[PDB]
């Protein structure tokens, strides 16, 4: 599987190198329910294309059957979008950086039913990351963990080997930062618990993002629609 054969540094560099670019939103500096979802669903659909190709570069993901690749991506796609959104919103306290030309606070977004609550949870996640001083090498590990873990018991032995590998990588990163043994497993735990909340945001987000009422506010792409239906 070669991914298991990788060293900790080899894993880190491979994950950093596979990082998708920060996309821009459709410009025009003009917000209703239709307009907000329009920009968001457009951005999400383009991000999905980059995510899928990113996943193929996650060490060990290629070794899975096509079916298993589909399942994991269908399960985790909104989680991965969100931890990405949370990541790039870190240096912007009180705001979500959907795109460099699309930076929003909580007041904008009550345009949309159910969006404010999810918004606040995202801001809370971002504030948590910043107070923990999350590093890039840690973030790429977490996002890869989401990919492999979130759909793994809806199936696995190989995936768990890789999960252990990323755990080894995370610990390796913390030891290099100068953390003590106690500080290492404390930080490891703190980070992994955030995944539980990211799952929660995705679940609550999905509940609003399918449902016919939200489906009808703006025509969605076939791809985005198929990713939504996978949770219904």
């Amino acid at each position: 599987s070669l991914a298991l054969s990788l060293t900790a540094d080899q894993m880190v560099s491979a994950l950093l190198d596979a990082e998708p670019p920060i996309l821009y939103s459709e410009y025009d500096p003009t917000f209703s329910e239709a307009s907000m979802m329009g920009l968001l669903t457009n951005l999400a659909d383009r991000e999905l294309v980059h995510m899928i190709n990113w996943a193929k570069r996650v060490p060990g993901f290629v070794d899975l059957t096509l079916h298993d690749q589909v399942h994991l991506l269908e399960c985790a796609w909104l989680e991965i979008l969100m931890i990405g959104l949370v990541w790039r919103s870190m240096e912007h306290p009180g705001k979500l950086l959907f795109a460099p030309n699309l930076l929003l606070d909580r007041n904008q977004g009550k345009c949309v039913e159910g969006m404010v609550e999810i918004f606040d949870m995202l801001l809370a996640t971002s504030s948590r990351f910043r107070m923990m001083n999350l590093q890039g090498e840690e973030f790429v590990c977490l996002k890869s963990i989401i990919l492999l873990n979130s759909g793994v018991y809806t199936f696995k032995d190989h995936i768990h080997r890789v999960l252990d590998k990323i755990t080894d990588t995370l610990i390796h990163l913390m030891a290099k930062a100068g953390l003590t043994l106690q500080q290492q497993h404390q930080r490891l735990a703190q980070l992994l618990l955030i995944l539980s909340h990211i799952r929660h945001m995705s679940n609550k987000g999905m509940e609003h993002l399918y449902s016919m009422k939200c489906k009808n506010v703006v025509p969605l792409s076939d791809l985005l629609l198929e990713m939504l239906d996978a949770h219904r």
């Binding site: 294309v49 899928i52 190709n53 193929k56 096509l66 589909v70 269908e74 076939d222 791809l223 198929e226």
Partner: peptide
């Protein structure tokens, strides 16, 4: 599905 296509290329 479309995801099938996007994963192969």
């Amino acid at each position: 599905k479309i995801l099938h296509r996007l994963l192969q290329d």
